Design an enzyme around this catalytic site. Structure first.
Site, mmCIF file in Angstrom:
data_model
loop_
_atom_site.group_PDB
_atom_site.id
_atom_site.type_symbol
_atom_site.label_atom_id
_atom_site.label_comp_id
_atom_site.label_asym_id
_atom_site.label_seq_id
_atom_site.Cartn_x
_atom_site.Cartn_y
_atom_site.Cartn_z
ATOM 1 N N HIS A 41 0.795 -1.221 0.000
ATOM 2 C CA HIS A 41 0.000 0.000 0.000
ATOM 3 C C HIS A 41 0.833 1.280 0.000
ATOM 4 C CE1 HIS A 41 0.505 -0.168 4.445
ATOM 5 N NE2 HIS A 41 0.317 1.135 4.384
ATOM 6 N N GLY A 143 3.894 6.245 12.549
ATOM 7 C CA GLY A 143 3.997 5.872 11.141
ATOM 8 C C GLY A 143 4.841 4.614 11.020
ATOM 9 N N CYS A 145 4.106 1.576 9.778
ATOM 10 C CA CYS A 145 3.777 0.551 8.793
ATOM 11 C C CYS A 145 5.081 0.005 8.256
ATOM 12 C CB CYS A 145 2.947 1.123 7.650
ATOM 13 S SG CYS A 145 1.249 1.377 8.087
#
Lengths: 302, 301
Positions: A41, A143, A145
């Site tokens: 993503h 953040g 990810c």
């Protein structure tokens, strides 16, 4: 004497984290040999998350579309492909810091350490367990990810998890290193709920056993119970029902302590219906459910 | 919210195995020195109130086996500093990070790299308890495992493990050899003050809950410090000093909740329990998260 949930030293994993940017998006990548792993993503730009066609977005991009940074030094990306929900960038330099490693898929109830990373840089490490609904708690907000989950065996590092999204309930969802999700979760921003947040009964028992080995013993009782009755009770309090295989897994721990599984079950049943009432077990005022029958051995049984 | 320990890489590269005679414990290698508990020189015939001074004299640099991986480091000097042994080795640790030795205080937090035989085995976040001890989970020979913080790129070493008190809790010293608490390195009666909850930290955790949208527990009334303190003592919470109120200021400032307001919220929560409700997930309050931890972590930058 003294029990405490511990994470695996993050050293060998910190030397594998990098930063991956595509367009205006930046997240964590996992650099092993000449490959960097990260959520697909990353090629999605904020609004394309509603319903992306990764196949379409990916073809519209070149190696030059990706910016990886080993800390500050930049790696040249000379190849890109997609393995399920993971992005696989082929780089020109083979990570000198690559440790011995394996890729494994774990099951709910199992534990592993997580090196929460912030935009490619290591921020914190914690020990957790994959919840029965296939999610991972530890609200490591940021953040992160691309943060990886793992276990350290002997010299080998086993990567079991990678972070992808925060569910509409808090808690997190991720993938293994093959790109396959854990749980009935999809790589989108569509409405999604995780199953019921339940306690990991197997682990709680493990913990009671460990406590027994640790001289703690006040909660024990001379009663014994059936697996069904114990299961009927457990469920009322939101504990997962104990399957047969689960009781087999409690075999060894039951060998030492000389306590039958159904014995310990009666002890827990009592704890559930009455409570600890201020008293503590192994130090906490609440039961620990993130310690596995195995952890109990890896640290005690010996 | 889940409490994390600092990544342990920089400290791992400083861990060595130190063995004197029949004992093996951990050591911290910074530059050309190895720091470890002086009781490694003990002999089985002298660990029940050892005469370290004498035991030290009866030793040469050869009594020491210093190990870092498969490589041995010849020790070429040895002196004692309080309850610590300082060994000068022939190699200067290429991995030494920028570091500082600091003396921490009860209530402050740190990461512990639990080691065994000079080998990094586990890592955890704990708080130095109010009775000057720590609730560490300790495996065989984890003595020498150290406590530290990571501020920027500088590693702050604040603790080294020596004893496991009769209560089961742990006692160690700073990186200068001086114990934390009224304890000594020897098997003696010695007991620690009862363990009380770190009020300052719980208040810190409630501020953090508020910053993350969790505020159902915010009462409406207020209380004085005296009144709050009395309720706290009742529930085994350490009393709150002016000192501690000032430390909460930054959090009070970011959220707009005066300190006495938050003490009012805690006061009610203690007198009534959480009614099953949760705060940051837990059904219980956390006290191993400091005010500064909330600032550092709740500010990604």
């Amino acid at each position: 004497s003294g029990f405490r949930k511990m994470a695996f030293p993050s050293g060998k994993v910190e030397g594998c984290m990098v930063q991956v940017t595509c367009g205006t998006t930046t997240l964590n990548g996992l650099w092993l040999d000449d490959t960097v792993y990260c959520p697909r993503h990353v090629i999605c730009t904020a609004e394309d998350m509603l319903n992306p066609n990764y196949e379409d977005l990916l073809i519209r991009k070149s190696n030059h579309s990706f910016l990886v940074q080993a800390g500050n030094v930049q790696l040249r990306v000379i190849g890109h492909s997609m393995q399920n929900c993971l992005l696989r960038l082929k780089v020109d330099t083979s990570n000198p810091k690559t440790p011995k490693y394996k890729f494994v898929r774990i099951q709910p109830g199992q534990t592993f350490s997580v090196l929460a990373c912030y935009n490619g840089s290591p921020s914190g490490v914690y020990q957790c367990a994959m919840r029965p609904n296939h999610t991972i708690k530890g609200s490591f907000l940021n953040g992160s990810c691309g943060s990886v989950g793992f276990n350290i065996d002997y010299d080998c590092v086993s990567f079991c998890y990678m972070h992808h999204m925060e569910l509409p309930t808090g808690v997190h969802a991720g993938t293994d290193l093959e790109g396959k999700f854990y749980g009935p979760f999809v790589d989108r921003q569509t409405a999604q709920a995780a199953g019921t947040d339940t306690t990991i009964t197997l682990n709680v028992l493990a913990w009671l056993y460990a406590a027994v080995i640790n001289g703690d013993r006040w909660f024990l009782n001379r009663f014994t119970t059936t697996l069904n009755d114990f299961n009927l009770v457990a469920m009322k309090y939101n504990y997962e029902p104990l399957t047969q295989d689960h009781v087999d897994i409690l075999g060894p721990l039951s060998a030492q302590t000389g306590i039958a599984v159904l014995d310990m079950c009666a002890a827990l049943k009592e704890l559930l219906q009455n409570g600890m009432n201020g008293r503590t077990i192994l130090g906490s005022t609440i039961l620990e459910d993130e310690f596995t029958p195995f952890d109990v051995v890896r640290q005690c049984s010996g």
